[PDB]
Design a binder for this molecule. Structure first.
Ligand SMILES: *C/C=C(C)/C=C/C=C(C)/C=C/C1=C(C)CCCC1(C)C
Length: 133
């Protein structure tokens, strides 16, 4: 389904370290974040998304409209400027972050009671799986 609405609690986090290292996230920061359990809160109304990612130490917020390019400055992460665009490929939601890093972005999809997130940067792929709360 395309309906990604809900509160989603992480059950699996594969290769978050590699993704973070490919982004050039500082070594000391990665040590904290690498095995933190995350919660994703997604509010989806038509093409409009509000997404909040929360953990014990880190909170993130991003709002976007599907099909509308937008500049991002990822200063709380790797501190870079990218041009972000989120679109649908079938029922897979695809974000491309155009900039210095190749293959940078993510794919997100629902399969059952679970939300899957694939974060990509360079040659690295992180896969996270969440269950709806
Ligand atoms: C729709 C799914 C989205 C927008 C996923 C967002 C995930 C993040 C913004 C994760 C950010 C972080 C890192 C990449 C490194 C560790 C610190 C975090 C959790 C803020």
């Amino acid at each position: 389904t395309r309906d990604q609405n809900g509160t989603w609690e992480m059950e699996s986090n594969e290769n978050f370290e590699g993704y973070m290292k490919a982004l050039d996230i500082d070594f000391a920061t990665r040590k904290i974040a690498v095995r933190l359990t995350q919660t994703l809160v997604i509010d989806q109304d038509g093409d409009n998304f509000k997404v909040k990612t929360t953990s014990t130490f880190f909170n993130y917020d991003v709002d976007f409209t599907v099909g509308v390019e937008f500049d991002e400055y990822t200063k709380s992460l790797d501190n870079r400027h990218v041009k972000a665009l989120v679109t649908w490929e079938g029922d897979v939601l695809v974000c491309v972050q155009k900039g210095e890093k190749e293959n940078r972005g993510w794919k997100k999809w629902i399969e059952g009671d679970k939300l899957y997130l694939e974060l990509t940067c360079g040659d690295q792929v992180c896969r996270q799986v969440f269950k709806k709360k």
